[PDB]
């Protein structure tokens, strides 16, 4: 019935300790408190990840090493993922609050969970990977194949899902959908329109590559055109979509330039499946706007319409000067070619056809 909504002061307190994103958890969760829509959605407490939960993807090897060195601050703990103090617990408590989502989905206590804090879609099972230390949303999907049959994984953030596509490249029960920048040197390098899975999973994989400044229309455009398709080819039973913000116009990224209201245009053919749904976020570096998209995303969920002026709350000199939820997009060009992008659309429709349930 009423979306469910992963939520715990300690939660939050754990994730606002992330060195990339500081205090973003607790913006997010800020403004959907100051529109009062936690009180249209049922809070859930997430659990903490068990070793063992975490091991349905992650190797041993991997998991004990991350341990041991999140004990004192060859498994990609470089550059980007630094073996930081305590970050295994910030690990664990996003990998469980997600599994907390997907658990909730299971026992039909709500079609929609939603764990804004998920979303790390570049670990591996063995490898950290781009900020990401744990793959939250495999250990979903893997949780949502106890009830459902086809797991569709769709990924909005502005980098390829390339972790969570890895993790199910070989099998046809899980397909996964990514729609992110692709361009010479840009993180992290994979999913060009011809990687489409391998052996028995090959065509179960799709991915859009998109160059910068993308805007609202010709991404629907696009993200229908993939759906609708893969809808129809798949059949779905259960969907999780991740929707990192870094696409928006103002992010530090300066790639795309999207707005909320493009996101959730998506969003909203999604949720007219009436499926299973699993929410997660992602990648977002502007804070504030990534709140205002989750913020405007979770009203899209909830189906209400919110006051375009960004009600007085903790944060809210971050949201100056104007002080609004809406986004304006930049006047950056948009260097997608028509005709590429149409090039695109039919090569994966084409692929699409090789599906058959
Ligand atoms: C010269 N030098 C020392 C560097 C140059 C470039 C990078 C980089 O691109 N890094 C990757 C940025 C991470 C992208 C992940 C963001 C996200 O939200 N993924 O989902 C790093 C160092
Ligand atoms: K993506
Ligand atoms: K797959
Ligand atoms: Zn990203």
Request: negative net charge.
């Amino acid at each position: 019935l009423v979306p469910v909504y992963i939520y715990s002061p300690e939660y939050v307190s754990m994730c606002d300790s992330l060195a990339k994103i500081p205090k973003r958890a607790s913006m997010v969760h800020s403004l959907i408190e100051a529109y009062a829509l936690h009180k249209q959605m049922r809070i859930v407490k997430p659990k903490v990840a068990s070793m063992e939960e975490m091991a349905t993807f992650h190797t041993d090897a991997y998991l004990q090493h991350l341990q041991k060195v999140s004990q004192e601050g060859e498994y990609g703990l470089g550059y980007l993922c630094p073996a930081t103090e305590g970050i295994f617990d910030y690990a664990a408590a996003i990998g469980g609050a997600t599994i907390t989502a997907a658990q909730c989905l299971i026992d039909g206590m709500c079609k929609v969970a939603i764990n804004w804090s998920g979303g790390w879609h570049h670990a591996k099972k063995d490898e950290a990977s781009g900020f990401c230390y744990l793959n939250d949303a495999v250990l979903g999907i893997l949780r949502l194949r106890r009830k459902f049959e086809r797991i569709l994984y769709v990924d909005l953030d502005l980098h390829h899902g390339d972790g969570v596509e890895d993790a199910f490249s070989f099998t046809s029960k899980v397909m996964t959908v990514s729609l992110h920048k692709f361009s010479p040197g840009f993180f992290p390098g994979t999913g060009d329109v011809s990687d489409v899975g391998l052996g028995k999973g090959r065509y179960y994989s799709v991915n859009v590559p998109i160059q910068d400044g993308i805007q609202d229309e010709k991404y629907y455009q696009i993200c229908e055109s993939v759906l609708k398709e893969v809808y129809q080819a798949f059949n779905p039973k259960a969907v999780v979509l991740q929707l990192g913000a870094d696409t928006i116009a103002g992010d530090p990224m300066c790639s795309f330039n999207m707005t909320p209201v493009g996101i959730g245009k998506c969003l909203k053919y999604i949720l007219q499946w009436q499926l299973a749904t699993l929410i997660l976020g992602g990648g977002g570096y502007n804070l504030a706007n990534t709140a205002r998209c989750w913020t405007y995303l979770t009203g899209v969920i909830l189906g209400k319409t919110l006051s375009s002026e960004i009600p007085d709350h903790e944060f809210f000199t971050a949201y100056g000067p104007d002080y609004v939820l809406e986004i304006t997009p930049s006047c950056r060009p948009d260097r997608n070619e028509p005709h590429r992008i149409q090039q695109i659309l039919n090569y994966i429709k084409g692929n699409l056809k090789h599906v058959v349930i």
